[PDB]
Design a binder for this molecule. Structure first.
Ligand code: N5D
Lengths: 179, 177
């Protein structure tokens, strides 16, 4: 029962995370790239500083990682293996975290109400800032979920220990990469 | 209408995720305590002045000293939390939380929140603490901590019973207006 609630949350929160990044890319990013709206000289052609590699993180989750987590739905005790298989893809969270400070100042110093206007226009409860923290939040949440499964899975749970190792190793490497 | 960013900081032992879920759903989640609370906004009226309240969790980032501050900029108010039945969590207000919150957001209102009020009068909890030569954190300890960190308020609450919980968030808003 507990291993089933945790797996269900893992999957449901993975879907919301893909939906959230998608929302971010097709509103806040799409306005900057469109050429449908007037763009503060301050941020112009600096979408790569603002959004960092979030495109590639979305692609990972949306192309691969949600499809693979789904396959482990009836195999919660094994799901640590999903993280092992895809450990390299998670290295993009290191790039993303390094860049986030630069992203945030740029938006303060140079974007005025550009994104606030798009937020109002599109009807979004989440600010561009609320969206841009999510990759940081998500990469530090996987280790919580894996620990929860470790509290309620048998000695058949080195198909968790090595998952958790990976998902402790990524956020520390991302942490240790900050200036 | 006024937007308010509220970040919730403190040890794993506070039950940050559970606090925010029990606040936003008007219920202790009981069966299963979810590990994920996603960034949240909701219109509330405070002193008859409607406000858009934003709540961000930080659960999972307790070991990443350089990742946590990524949420800090442009925060209107911090809840700095400890569990009333974790002396360690209480000391970490002084040792860990207040320093990094001051370092990055010097002029931002802090509410000091003691969580798990329902466990301060619980025999098993009390006894478990006595075995480590400890007691729960009492009211004057929180007041004295609040003063020391420049907290605008010290408040005690239970996610379980909902006691003091709504007041915590009312006061977070009041500390900004
Ligand atoms: C915030 C806030 C208040 C609150 N109160 C809360 O969680 N109370 C509660 C009731 N029964 N348990 C299980 C438990 O921990 N039992 C003892 C360790 C053996 C916990 N939680 O978050």
């Amino acid at each position: 029962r507990k291993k089933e609630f945790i797996m269900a949350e893992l999957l449901q929160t993975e879907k919301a995370y893909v939906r959230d990044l998608h929302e971010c890319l097709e509103t806040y990013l799409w306005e900057m790239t469109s050429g449908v709206e007037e763009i503060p000289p301050g941020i112009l052609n600096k979408e790569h500083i603002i959004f960092g590699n979030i495109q590639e993180i979305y692609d990972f989750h949306n192309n691969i990682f949600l499809k693979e987590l789904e396959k482990y739905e009836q195999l919660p005790e094994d799901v640590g293996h999903c993280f092992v298989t895809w450990a390299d893809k998670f290295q993009m969270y290191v790039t993303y975290c390094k860049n986030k400070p630069d992203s945030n100042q740029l938006i303060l110093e140079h974007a005025g109400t550009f994104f606030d206007e798009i937020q109002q226009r599109h009807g979004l409860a989440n600010s561009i800032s609320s969206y841009l923290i999510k990759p940081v939040q998500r990469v530090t949440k996987y280790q919580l979920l894996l620990k929860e499964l470790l509290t309620c899975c048998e000695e058949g749970k080195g198909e968790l220990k090595d998952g958790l190792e990976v998902m402790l190793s990524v956020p520390k490497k991302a942490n240790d990469a900050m200036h | 209408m006024q937007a308010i960013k509220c970040v919730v900081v403190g040890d794993g032992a506070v039950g940050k995720t559970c606090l925010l879920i029990s606040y936003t759903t008007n219920a202790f989640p009981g069966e299963y305590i979810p590990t994920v609370f996603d960034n949240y906004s909701a219109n509330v009226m405070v002193d008859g002045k409607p406000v858009n309240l934003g709540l961000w969790d930080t659960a999972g980032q307790e070991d990443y000293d350089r990742l946590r501050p990524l949420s800090y900029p442009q925060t209107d108010v911090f809840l700095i939390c400890f569990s009333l039945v974790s002396p360690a969590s209480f000391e970490n207000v002084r040792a860990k939380w207040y320093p990094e919150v001051r370092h990055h957001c010097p002029n931002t209102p802090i509410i000091l929140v003691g969580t798990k009020l329902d466990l301060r009068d619980d025999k098993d909890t009390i006894e478990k603490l006595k075995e480590k030569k400890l007691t729960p954190i009492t009211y004057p300890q929180g007041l004295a901590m609040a003063k020391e960190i420049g907290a605008v308020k010290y408040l005690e609450c239970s996610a379980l019973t909902q006691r003091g919980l709504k007041t915590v968030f009312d006061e977070a808003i009041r500390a900004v207006l």
